[PDB]
């Protein structure tokens, strides 16, 4: 379904010298929630329309959860139909890649574990999508025969009996209005460093889709952007200070629709909204003000550690039977932020480098001037493969994507034949994988 006429929309947003930073702030306050998107549903219609009419590019490309909601919800003419035909091509093919993966790995099951979990790594559930908002962890603690250590800083995480003492379960915003006074007093009185409480919204089994989120983050995104993305740490207390402490947000007499540039101060909401041309109404930011009540506190980096597959138990170490990842709680991925409004960008967001495709020095130098001072100090580390991630985050001799996966995304064209190359790349090199390919004459 995806043809080269719609990667050229997706690719050219990743190389924008002026990507709107205001829409990037809306993304931080849905944080993957279904009904908190319905709250801000008419706001992002004013964003996508005034970004598709101004330049020929669309917005909200980066995260999976925003793209899924624009396809399912907002089916009317709330956003331009020519721009709507590019979102339906994304998911309509990304389902079709998931139907092809189910056709290779046959109907047979080895033991209790099916063959589909053991042939392709994209269908392997122990692979997690690198950004997590709902509670994927206790779902994987429950149904894995392979032993899933979860390291949150110092402490481990083994029994799902202990899911209340490590992972704090939120709820949707309607029910939590009663407990909401005490929730705010956990943002101030508590020291969020060395806390090891991991604030994550609860998961429902029906709307959950693990494989489609991998095919977005690991296959479609690093090809189309040619591997120029980073993980974004945010502190939400600094972000909603700017939206709410604004003047006309706080004023009463102002009507329904009294577009903001009438009523301003010299704050950062000028230079965030000056650079995007967006003129929303004041009552619509007031809905983004309500997002602060259930904002999860700090972006945390959890580390999932799973034992290798039973076809791959043989190794040298005592840790060689055991292979880890990194999964961001409460964070998300970012393209190259504009060189316009970099000074307003430093007040909200900060760069943290991740798995392999998401440690990119062109993006991370934009976000903080210390790393921009690092890469321009010595230009060896400018490359996406060579660039050094802190050992407190990852060792790259462990994760499911080693170094030459990131070398492939940086050197591709945007051809749709290279989308199907990444899927054929995640074959698992095991011995009962070889039974599947040699049967189908691959």
């Amino acid at each position: 379904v995806i043809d080269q006429l719609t990667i050229d929309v997706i690719q050219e947003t990743a190389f924008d010298p002026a990507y709107p930073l205001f829409c990037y702030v809306i993304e931080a306050m849905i944080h993957g929630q279904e009904e908190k998107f319905v709250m801000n549903m008419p706001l992002i219609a004013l964003v996508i329309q005034t970004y598709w009419v101004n330049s020929g590019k669309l917005a909200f490309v980066n995260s999976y959860h925003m793209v899924r909601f624009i396809c399912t919800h907002m089916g009317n003419g709330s956003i331009p139909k020519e721009a709507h035909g590019h979102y339906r091509k994304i998911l309509g093919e990304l389902i079709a890649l998931e139907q092809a993966l189910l056709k290779l790995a046959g109907h047979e099951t080895v033991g209790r574990t099916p063959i589909t979990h053991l042939v392709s790594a994209l269908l392997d559930p122990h692979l997690l999508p690198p950004f997590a908002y709902h509670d994927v962890f206790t779902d994987l603690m429950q149904k894995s025969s392979r032993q899933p250590i979860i390291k949150i800083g110092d402490q481990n995480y083994d029994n799902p009996q202990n899911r209340a003492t490590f992972i704090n379960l939120r709820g949707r915003m309607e029910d939590l209005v009663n407990n909401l006074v005490n929730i705010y007093q956990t943002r101030v009185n508590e020291d969020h460093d060395e806390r090891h409480v991991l604030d994550v919204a609860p998961l429902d089994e029906n709307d959950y889709n693990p494989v489609l989120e991998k095919l977005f983050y690991y296959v479609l995104m690093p090809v189309c952007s040619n591997g120029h993305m980073c993980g974004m740490g945010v502190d939400y207390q600094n972000v909603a200070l700017t939206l709410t402490y604004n003047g006309p947000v706080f004023a009463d007499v102002v009507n329904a629709q009294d577009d903001i540039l009438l009523h301003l101060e010299n704050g950062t909401l000028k230079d965030i909204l000056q650079a995007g041309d967006i003129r929303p109404t004041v009552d619509m930011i007031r809905v983004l003000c309500t997002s602060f009540l259930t904002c999860p506190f700090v972006t945390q980096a959890a580390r999932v550690i799973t034992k290798r597959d039973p076809a791959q138990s043989f190794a040298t170490h005592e840790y060689g039977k055991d292979v880890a990842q990194t999964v961001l709680v409460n964070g998300f991925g970012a393209f190259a932020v504009a060189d316009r409004s970099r000074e307003a960008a430093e007040t909200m967001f900060y760069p943290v480098p991740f798995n392999k495709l998401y440690a990119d020095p062109l993006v991370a130098a934009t976000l903080h001037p210390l790393l921009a001072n690092y890469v321009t100090r010595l230009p060896n580390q400018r490359n996406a493969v060579v660039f050094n991630v802190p050992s407190n985050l990852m060792a790259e001799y462990e994760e499911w994507h080693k170094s030459p996966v990131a070398a492939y995304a940086a050197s591709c064209q945007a051809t749709p034949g290279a989308i199907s190359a990444m899927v054929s790349m995640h074959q698992k090199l095991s011995a009962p994988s070889f039974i599947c390919q040699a049967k189908h004459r691959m």
């Binding site: 915003m173 604004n246 101060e265 007031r286 009540l293 430093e346």
Partner: protein
């Protein structure tokens, strides 16, 4: 600044400029405690953020209550 993000540039003292507002009296209900005068005005600003958000969400649930039968069907008679 090695442990926090950079603070944003926003004009100070929203209380002295507008209010005339009931929630600014609610700001004064927060007690100082052990924090200094520079530390008090920061956390008093954060507490104003919590009051504006709780106010507009309670107003939002009244807005999404939907139109009711008896009050609307009586006005259609006229």
């Amino acid at each position: 600044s090695n442990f926090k993000v950079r603070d944003p540039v926003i004009q100070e003292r929203l209380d002295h400029d507008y209010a005339h507002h009931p929630l600014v009296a609610r700001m004064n209900t927060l007690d100082q405690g052990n924090m200094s005068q520079a530390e008090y005005l920061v956390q008093k600003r954060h507490y104003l953020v919590f009051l504006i958000a709780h106010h507009y969400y309670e107003a939002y649930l009244r807005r999404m209550g939907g139109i009711q039968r008896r009050d609307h069907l009586q006005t259609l008679r006229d």
